[PDB]
Design a protein around this ligand. Structure first.
Ligand SMILES: CCCCCCCCCCCCCCCCCC(=O)OC[C@H](CO[C@@H]1O[C@H](CO[C@H]2O[C@H](CO)[C@H](O)[C@H](O)[C@H]2O)[C@H](O)[C@H](O)[C@H]1O)OC(=O)CCCCCCCCCCCCCCCCC
Ligand SMILES: CCCCCCCCCCCCCCCCCC(=O)OC[C@H](CO[C@@H]1O[C@H](CO[C@H]2O[C@H](CO)[C@H](O)[C@H](O)[C@H]2O)[C@H](O)[C@H](O)[C@H]1O)OC(=O)CCCCCCCCCCCCCCCCC
Ligand code: CLA
Ligand code: CLA
Ligand code: CLA
Ligand code: CLA
Ligand code: CLA
Ligand SMILES: CCCCCCCCCCCCCCCCCC(=O)OC[C@H](CO[C@@H]1O[C@H](CO)[C@H](O)[C@H](O)[C@H]1O)OC(=O)CCCCCCCCCCCCCCCCC
Ligand SMILES: CC1=C(/C=C/C(C)=C/C=C/C(C)=C/C=C/C=C(C)/C=C/C=C(C)/C=C/C2=C(C)CCCC2(C)C)C(C)(C)CCC1
Ligand SMILES: CC1=C(/C=C/C(C)=C/C=C/C(C)=C/C=C/C=C(C)/C=C/C=C(C)/C=C/C2=C(C)CCCC2(C)C)C(C)(C)CCC1
Ligand SMILES: CC1=C(/C=C/C(C)=C/C=C/C(C)=C/C=C/C=C(C)/C=C/C=C(C)/C=C/C2=C(C)CCCC2(C)C)C(C)(C)CCC1
Lengths: 23, 148, 449, 120, 480, 188
């Protein structure tokens, strides 16, 4: 399957999970 | 869902399909884009085109004058005959000194005749156009004899 | 010089202190002429120096050289530029001539007398002296008539002007049968300014142009003699303000209209402004694009005749509201366009698909392709392109420059007419400075509401 | 209505040459409606109303039917010029009207007029 | 003849009728409070508290009443959805009726104060002219204000005597009015820390009381009194306008950015929540957990609460609305009926495709399906002459897990594209747009409307402060 | 904070208009203005670049493992073109229509082969090359030029380069960039 981030990001690139820890 | 159909149109390029693209290549010199240089380079091609114009002026045009098709007759002039003046000039340029000068003189006398005939078509004078066309034919034949 | 304390005009209105100074006014006008002639010569030589034979004049942003080329100088079959020395001669002549005019103006502005009436009565003139004013107009009217006839002479003698519609190809042609029929010559004047009629901008034959200059040339010379031997009639004196500013306002208004007409001529006319030297006209560029694709698609294997577009009004060809067959697309607005490269394919009823199917000459294509690319669309930084285009092409149609510049010039000069005319009328009445503060007319008028 | 006789194959006598002709869609697939929805190029859905983007509006949205219809035409030669090889006569045809890409039903349009041709 | 924009200046020097005119305004406000509440109660449906919450029903005053405790109603129904066993005098209807009766009482009081405006109390004893000791008036009012603030935070909010305040879980899936305990710590300043309300109101309250005593005891400085025109009623008006407009901005921001004082299950979800995928991440999180436990996709998605899924919907986003799109959220999208279930879009290759959600800033967003990597693998092409990601050529099939379409698979291009368009709007829920005849356009939540109205009032009141303040400073010039 | 002096009165770095690029067994001079793209239009996409503005002007380098050790093994160039027709794209539109001028019934897109060639690199490997112009009923960009070249690398992998240019830009200079990159493409 895909990680929550591997799912939240493609659905919403500005999701906190995808927009955080990116460093 | 259907695959986009494909057609072998490679023959279009043979029938001057790149003329528009070449004319739109600003990188090419203006003469190259206009084809002036190409024609001046191809003597045989220029000479051929000249004979094509001769046929149009001789074995043609008179038809419209007979049926008073002025629009077609005036459009008969120019069109393919449009390059005739440029063609005659380069052929005369092939000559030298007196030969070139004499040839250019014949070219001028013919150019004047074609304008007289055109004005006759403009005034829609069939009688004047008829006689004027005969004069133009003689002029062209004289220039052709020199340029060719 | 002069000071406001003795003239009542501030430095920003100093030239207005020369209204009654005939001698100084002469120097000012003569000097300004030097400036005009100077630019004509200087810019011409600049263009000649910056000219390249590998590109068309329009691509080189040249405006003066096209004028000389149209007069039939250093041009050859197809509009090809044979030599440029004739253009160099023009620049040199104007530049040196400007020196003579400059010296005369400086002299008539420094050493020359502030007034001439006291010494040279002939030159001496006083605004309001209608007789003298009309005589001065006459002299200049004759001069303009001679100038028009000089052009007519160049057309039928001393070579000929370039004819873009010349038979068997476009090249210089000596006009031999200039139109003298008044109906044809004056027909343009009574033509509607709307589409189709195009008023005088419709002139497409050099015969009418030269013939029209023949008419204007004679009338101007005759009119000059008339004004030289006649004085304004009572009706005129009772319906005109006789003052220097009033006379200037009349000229400002007229020249302003002429500016607008020149803008339209450069934007629409292709005969007086050969597309070979001035580039294609807006309508010409659009029609050229339709022709370019029509030809390409037809060669690929498309029936342009039965090619229904998305709206169903014909993708390549359609019918004008009048009925004439015209190119399809938004170019339908330019259906009244006429160019030497498209006429041969046309016929009594709009375009002739027969010619479009066969008889299409290669030049008819090459020319259209070149015009399509060099359309009048451009930017202030000279970034050639319809719009929303990357900075790659450096070209702005010379037609665009002339059309935009002369339009703006015409607008300002019209505003100048309103300013000078109104002030002249107010001056005559006496209320130019302001209200009397004791004879306020409103205070004597009805209380209205 | 798109007056047309595309693909007419009349096969009657010298007069009354009955035949059928194609009646292509007044508008092409590319043609976009005010909403932007179209055949080959279009939204296909009521983007304006997101909640009602897809519903009974289907008749107008995602339809844009561009199927061509058929019409009947009859031609008759009134006169023939043998020397000039020219023929002229009257024509009568009933064709369907625009269907707004299927949005509206077509309507019969009876077009009568004169026809001229040169047999060369 | 006072100009129309100067008619109410007649009571500027009439303290007796100033109370009357103020009593009127208070009565009008009290009347609207109970009136609007009565109207909302008459037009409120408590049948479905999940897919038909108050904010979806467009209720505005009901949320505030519920926020402080009011939950039951004489209609035998609770805002929770259960039957109101004993709504009591403080039923939604009761509190409304109370405000209406208060309005009436205030009206009669206003009449008396207007008639009997000449009270010796207003007169100053030294001169006999009507004079108000603004310095002390503020002090006494401040002291009383502090008392109420401390009492509300230490009793009504704390719960010791007051009913309590509405507190909900971070995902507003479960919440109600429960007594809170003052944080009295750094966390107390966290806007999402309910305890802060009690601690702040208690702290601010006690200080206010002390500050009130100071203004009552200590007199104003001579330099300050004149410098601040402490003898002018317009002076307090200008400064008071500055305070109200300042609070309005703070109150609005609290509603827009969200806080423990603005429950998402009472005012609707915040726009930022969707922008950061707050509820979406939770749904996927628990789903992954259930899958990790070993449950099927259907089981995990079936576990997802419809309320949580309902929050994950662009429609509930407050920013997704129009200025003139009047009406309840239910109107314009229909009344939520149920959840179709999670839609799983997969290409023929078997790769799971994710439909890019519509950004709030976009009224219309193109449908795009991307892989976990984030590479577009499918979409609905505007031009279909030669597509390279067409749902058809990509062969995308949508399978719904949980909800109404649980176990339902769709391969029809049209059907898949339809669900794809809904997916981009978040969770796919069934909506009845017939009962209210919805127009099909999204509306703003009461949260967004409140923020817009109060921000507007605040910006305008800024001009009010400058105007009245300028008049006080330039009273001599404005005198006339 | 490297103390690099400004190039005041200096010399331009690169004015060739092409930036040399190196990939896995393939090398070519990408147009300088063109920017990297992140859209895998087809399977096996290795390099994908697009013009700064018009995305129609794009370049894709597809590498697919193929048993055949020679592009000739695939068969005649015409046969290979048929197998690589997927690049031209597919008409999703299925509506029956006959109101599209210059297009066959129910066809809203037409691709026309205008040139075919088999150039060989110094290494010796040949290159099946094809030039086609795809037209659409909408006629966007006045047609899309398609330059497709293919060859098998020593890694027994088929490398295909497809450059697409909107006719509008094609006759406005974009052709020079496309041709340069297409000729620059070399597989080892
Ligand atoms: C401060 C204002 C800006 C001052 C800029 C000074 C230099 C300049 O001007 O910059 C421009 C040039 C100097 O720069 C050259 O400007 C050229 C402008 O294009 C011209 O030359 C091009 C060459 O490829 C093309 O031929 C093109 O068609 C042609 O227009 C090119 O861009 C050259 O590359 C560039 O070096 O000087 C000039 O033109 C001088 C222009 C003098 C006045 C011209 C008036 C034109 C009409 C004005 C009224 C109508 C509309 C006004 C609208 C506003
Ligand atoms: C006059 C005002 C109305 C103009 C109406 C109009 O359709 O305007 C355009 C017309 C020109 O019309 C066009 O004139 C064209 C002339 O070209 C034709 O003839 C040419 C000859 O070389 C070519 O052959 C060309 O291909 C061919 O089309 C054609 O006839 C077109 O059909 C025709 O539409 O202007 C004219 O006739 C000249 C009018 C005088 C100049 C006016 C300029 C604007 C003035 C003021 C603007 C500001 C006002 C402020 C407030 C006051
Ligand atoms: C409690 C706040 C408050 C109070 C008590 C006052 C009081 C006063 N103001 Mg004022 N003002 C305020 C806020 C306030 N203002 C704000 C926020 C602004 C910024 C927009 C202004 C801008 C302002 C100006 C520009 C002026 C005054 C003026 C006046 C004086 C004349 C009143 C008048 O014209 O009769 C009222 C007669 C009317 C016809 C007005 C009523 C019409 C309204 C629009 C209809 C009611 C709409 C609605 C019910 C309003 C309540 C909305 C609320 C529920 C949110 C008066 C003493 C005038 C003055 O000269 O100052 C001394 C003056 O010109 N004010
Ligand atoms: C086309 C532009 C132009 C021209 C031709 C003139 C011409 C004239 N102006 Mg004038 N002026 C102008 C623009 C112009 N002006 C502008 C833009 C302003 C606003 C700043 C003014 C404001 C102004 C005022 C306030 C006054 C004049 C005045 C005058 C007159 C005499 C000048 C004078 O008294 O001292 C002459 C000035 C000089 C000797 C300084 C140098 C000028 C020389 C002649 C210029 C030569 C330059 C050129 C390179 C020489 C070529 C030599 C050759 C061998 C190549 C004269 C006819 C005066 C007048 O007569 O009022 C009644 C006056 O008082 N002007
Ligand atoms: C050949 C045409 C012409 C002539 C002979 C005059 C002559 C005169 N004008 Mg005038 N004017 C004209 C055209 C003309 N104008 C036009 C077209 C306009 C519309 C814009 C005006 C608007 C105008 C105004 C508003 C005024 C005058 C005034 C005057 C008088 C004062 C002279 C002066 O200012 O002293 C010296 C010269 C100057 C101070 C000019 C300074 C140089 C200018 C300001 C710089 C402009 C450069 C320009 C941007 C370059 C581009 C020009 C063009 C390409 C757009 C004078 C007799 C003044 C007056 O009182 O009338 C009696 C006055 O108030 N004019
Ligand atoms: C509109 C053009 C124009 C006009 C109307 C005049 C008019 C006049 N000029 Mg003159 N002049 C002009 C252009 C013009 N000039 C130019 C372009 C030059 C440069 C060559 C001269 C150089 C010139 C000189 C050197 C002299 C005149 C002189 C004169 C005055 C008498 C002429 C004469 O021969 O008797 C004498 C007269 C009022 C004479 C004069 O005394 O000035 C007032 C005189 O000395 N002009
Ligand atoms: C241990 C005791 C205690 C505790 C736990 C707290 C806890 C808290 N207090 Mg607090 N407080 C206390 C004691 C305590 N206080 C005491 C003794 C006082 C003095 C009486 C105060 C006075 C006080 C004030 C005045 C405020 C708080 C606020 C808060 C809350 C912080 C969230 C916030 O800032 O709101 C949200 C964010 C802000 C307020 C920052 C924005 C402020 C700007 C400047 C306002 C905009 C004004 C301007 C006109 C806008 C221009 C337009 C704009 C678009 C730019 C928080 C829960 C705030 C609150 O009430 O929350 C709503 C707040 O405003 N307290
Ligand atoms: C006078 C006309 C004013 C507008 C009337 C709208 C009438 C209407 O149809 O909708 C009136 C709408 C309700 O609208 C109706 O709602 C119904 C359900 O309750 C249904 O859904 C109906 O379909 C819907 O039309 O309510 C109102 O707008 C009345 C209150 C007006 C103010 C509300 C928002 C306040 C925001 C800011 C306030 C401060 C502003 C400061 C600005 C500076
Ligand atoms: C009055 C006055 C004024 C002014 C005026 C003017 C405007 C003057 C001018 C005048 C002028 C108008 C001048 C001019 C001059 C020029 C010249 C003198 C020229 C010369 C030339 C030469 C020397 C040569 C050259 C050459 C040739 C041609 C060939 C090639 C090469 C060369 C280029 C080298 C003012 C405003 C200040 C104000 C005050 C008063
Ligand atoms: C060359 C040529 C030609 C010709 C042209 C012409 C012929 C022109 C002319 C034109 C003209 C013909 C002009 C004139 C003008 C004038 C006018 C237009 C008038 C005006 C008037 C006024 C301004 C007045 C007013 C008033 C009144 C009446 C009332 C009272 C007051 C007053 C007096 C003010 C042509 C075409 C072939 C083309 C080509 C070239
Ligand atoms: C007398 C009396 C009585 C009765 C009372 C009552 C009945 C009260 C209530 C009253 C009321 C019933 C009040 C209310 C009124 C209303 C209001 C106060 C509101 C207004 C509105 C507004 C102000 C708004 C405006 C606006 C618009 C609409 C648009 C947008 C914006 C806004 C929202 C701003 C009793 C039994 C107690 C006993 C004693 C005596």
């Amino acid at each position: 399957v895909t990680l929550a981030l591997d799912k939240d990001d493609p659905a919403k690139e500005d999701s906190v999970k995808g927009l955080r820890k990116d460093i | 869902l259907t695959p986009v159909d494909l057609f072998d149109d490679r023959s279009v390029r043979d029938r001057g399909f790149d003329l528009i693209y070449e004319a739109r290549d600003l990188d090419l010199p203006q003469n190259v884009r206009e084809g002036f240089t190409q024609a001046r380079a191809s003597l045989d091609e220029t000479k051929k085109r000249v004979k094509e114009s001769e046929a149009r002026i001789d074995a043609d045009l008179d038809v419209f004058i007979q049926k008073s098709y002025w629009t077609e007759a005036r459009e008969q002039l120019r069109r393919q005959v449009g390059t005739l003046r440029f063609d005659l000039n380069t052929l005369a340029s092939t000559k030298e000194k007196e030969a070139k000068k004499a040839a250019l003189g014949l070219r001028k006398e013919f150019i004047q005749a074609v304008e007289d005939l055109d004005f006759a078509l403009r005034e829609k004078d069939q009688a004047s156009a008829a006689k004027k066309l005969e004069i133009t034919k003689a002029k062209l034949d004289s220039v052709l004899a020199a340029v060719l | 010089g002069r000071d406001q304390e003795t003239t009542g005009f501030a430095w920003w209105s100093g030239n207005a202190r020369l209204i009654n100074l005939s001698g100084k006014l002469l120097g000012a006008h003569v000097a300004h002429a030097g400036l005009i002639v100077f630019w004509a010569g200087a810019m011409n030589l600049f263009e000649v120096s910056h000219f390249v034979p590998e590109k068309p004049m329009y691509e080189q942003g040249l405006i003066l050289l096209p004028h000389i080329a149209t007069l039939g100088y250093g041009v050859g079959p197809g509009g090809e530029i044979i030599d440029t020395f004739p253009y160099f001669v023009s620049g040199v002549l104007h530049l040196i001539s400007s020196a003579v005019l400059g010296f005369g103006g400086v002299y008539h502005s420094l050493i020359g007398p502030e007034t001439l009436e006291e010494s040279y009565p002939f030159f001496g003139y006083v605004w309001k002296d209608k007789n003298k004013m009309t005589n001065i107009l006459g002299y200049h009217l004759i001069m303009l008539g001679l100038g028009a006839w000089l052009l007519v002479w160049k057309a039928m003698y001393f070579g000929g002007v370039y004819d873009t519609w010349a038979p068997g190809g476009g090249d210089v042609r000596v006009i031999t049968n200039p139109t003298t029929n008044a109906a044809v010559i004056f027909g343009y004047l009574v033509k509607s300014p709307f589409g189709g009629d195009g008023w005088i901008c419709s002139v497409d034959n050099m015969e009418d142009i030269i013939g029209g200059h023949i008419w204007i040339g004679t009338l101007e010379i005759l009119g000059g003699i008339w004004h030289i031997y006649t004085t304004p009639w009572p009706w005129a004196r009772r319906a005109f303000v006789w003052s220097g500013e009033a006379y200037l306002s009349y000229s400002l208004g007229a020249i302003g209209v002429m500016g607008f007409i020149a803008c339209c001529m450069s934007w629409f006319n292709n005969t007086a402004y050969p597309s070979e030297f001035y580039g294609p006209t807006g309508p010409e560029a659009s029609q050229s694009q339709a022709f370019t694709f029509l030809v390409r698609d037809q060669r690929l294997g498309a029936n342009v005749a039965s090619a229904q577009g998305p709206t169903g009004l014909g993708k390549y060809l359609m019918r004008s509201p009048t009925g004439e067959i015209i190119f399809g697309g938004e170019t339908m607005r330019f259906w009244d366009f006429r160019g030497p490269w498209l006429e041969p394919l046309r016929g009594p009823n709009g375009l002739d698909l027969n010619k479009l199917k066969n008889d299409i000459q290669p030049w008819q294509e090459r020319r259209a392709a070149e015009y399509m690319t060099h359309a009048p669309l451009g930017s202030l930084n000279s970034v050639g392109g319809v719009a929303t285009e990357i900075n790659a092409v450096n070209f702005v149609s010379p037609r665009s420059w002339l059309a935009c510049s002369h339009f703006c010039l015409g607008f300002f000069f019209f505003i100048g007419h309103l300013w000078h005319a109104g002030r002249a009328r107010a001056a005559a009445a006496g209320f130019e400075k302001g209200i009397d503060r004791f004879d306020e007319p409103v205070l004597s008028m009805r209380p209205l509401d | 209505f798109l007056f047309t006789i595309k693909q007419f194959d009349g096969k009657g006598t010298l007069d009354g040459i009955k035949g059928d002709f194609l009646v292509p869609s007044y508008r092409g697939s590319s043609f976009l409606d005010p909403k932007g929805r179209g055949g080959s190029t279009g939204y296909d859905n009521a983007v304006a109303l997101p909640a009602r983007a897809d519903a009974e509006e289907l008749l107008k949205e995602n339809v844009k039917i561009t199927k061509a219809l058929k019409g009947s035409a009859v031609f008759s030669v009134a006169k023939v010029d043998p020397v000039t090889g020219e023929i002229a006569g009257v024509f009568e045809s009933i064709q369907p009207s625009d269907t707004d890409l299927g949005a509206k039903p077509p309507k019969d349009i009876k077009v009568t007029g004169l026809w001229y041709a040169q047999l060369k | 003849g006072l100009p129309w924009y100067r008619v109410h200046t007649v009571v500027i020097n009439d303290p007796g009728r100033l109370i009357s005119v103020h009593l009127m305004h208070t009565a009008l406000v009290s009347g609207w409070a109970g009136s609007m509440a009565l109207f909302e109660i008459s037009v409120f449906d408590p049948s479905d508290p999940v897919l038909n919450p108050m904010w979806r029903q467009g209720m505005f005053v009901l949320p505030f009443m519920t926020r402080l405790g009011i939950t039951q109603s004489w209609g035998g129904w609770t805002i929770s959805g259960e039957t109101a066993t004993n709504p009591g005098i403080w039923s939604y209807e009761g509190v409304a009726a109370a405000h209406i009766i208060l309005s009436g009482a205030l009206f009669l009081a206003s009449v008396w104060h207007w008639t009997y405006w000449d009270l010796e109390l207003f007169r100053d004893p030294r001169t006999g002219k009507t004079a108000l000791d603004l310095p002390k008036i503020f002090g006494i009012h401040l002291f009383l204000s502090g008392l109420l603030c401390f009492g509300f935070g230490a009793f009504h909010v704390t719960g010791v005597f007051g009913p309590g305040i509405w507190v909900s879980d971070p995902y507003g899936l479960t919440g109600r009015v429960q007594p809170v305990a003052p944080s009295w710590g750094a966390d107390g300043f966290d806007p999402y820390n309910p305890g802060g309300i009690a601690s702040h109101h208690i702290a601010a309250g006690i200080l206010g009381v002390l500050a009130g005593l100071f203004h009552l005891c200590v007199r104003p400085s001579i330099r300050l009194y004149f410098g601040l025109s402490m003898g002018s009623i317009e002076t307090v008006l200008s400064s008071s306008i500055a305070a109200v407009f300042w609070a309005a901005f703070v109150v609005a921001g609290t509603m827009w950015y969200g806080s423990a004082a603005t429950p998402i299950e009472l005012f609707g979800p915040t726009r930022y929540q969707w922008d950061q995928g707050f509820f979406q991440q939770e749904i996927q999180k628990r789903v992954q957990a259930s899958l990790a436990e070993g449950a099927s996709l259907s089981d995990a998605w079936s576990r997802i609460p419809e309320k949580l899924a309902f929050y994950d919907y662009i429609g509930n986003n407050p920013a997704k609305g129009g200025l003139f799109r009047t009406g309840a959220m239910n109107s314009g999208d229909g009344i939520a009926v149920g959840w179709l279930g999670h839609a799983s879009f997969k290409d023929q290759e078997g790769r799971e495709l994710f439909v890019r959600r519509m950004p709030t800033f976009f009224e219309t967003f193109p449908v795009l399906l991307l892989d976990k990597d984030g590479i577009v693998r499918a979409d609905v092409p505007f031009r279909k002459a030669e597509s390279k990601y067409s749902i058809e050529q990509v062969g995308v099939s949508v399978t719904f897990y949980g909800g109404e379409l649980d176990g339902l698979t769709f391969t029809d291009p049209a059907t898949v594209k339809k669900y794809a368009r809904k997916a981009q709007l978040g969770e796919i829920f069934e909506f009845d747009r017939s009962t209210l005849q919805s127009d099909g356009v999204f509306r703003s939540s009461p949260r967004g409307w409140f923020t817009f109205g109060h921000v507007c009032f605040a910006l305008l009141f800024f001009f009010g402060h400058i105007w009245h303040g300028a008049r006080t400073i330039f009273r001599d010039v404005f005198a006339g | 904070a490297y103390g690099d002096s400004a190039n005041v009165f200096g010399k331009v770095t690169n004015k060739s208009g092409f930036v040399p690029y190196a990939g896995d067994g393939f090398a070519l001079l990408l147009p300088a203005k063109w920017n990297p793209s992140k859209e895998n239009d087809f399977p096996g996409v290795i390099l994908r670049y697009e013009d700064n503005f018009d995305a129609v002007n794009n370049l894709v380098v597809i590498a697919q493992d193929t048993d055949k050790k020679a592009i000739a093994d695939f068969g005649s160039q015409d046969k290979f073109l048929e197998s690589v027709s997927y690049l031209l794209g597919k008409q999703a539109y299925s509506g029956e229509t006959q109101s599209e001028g210059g297009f066959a019934p129910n066809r809203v897109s037409a691709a026309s082969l205008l040139d075919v060639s088999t150039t060989t690199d110094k290494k010796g490997k040949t290159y099946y090359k094809y030039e086609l112009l795809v037209r659409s009923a909408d006629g966007d960009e006045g047609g899309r030029h398609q330059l497709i070249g293919a060859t098998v690398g020593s890694d027994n992998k088929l490398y295909i380069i497809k450059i697409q240019i909107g006719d509008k830009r094609w006759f406005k200079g974009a052709k020079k960039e496309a041709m340069g990159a297409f000729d620059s493409f070399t597989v080892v």
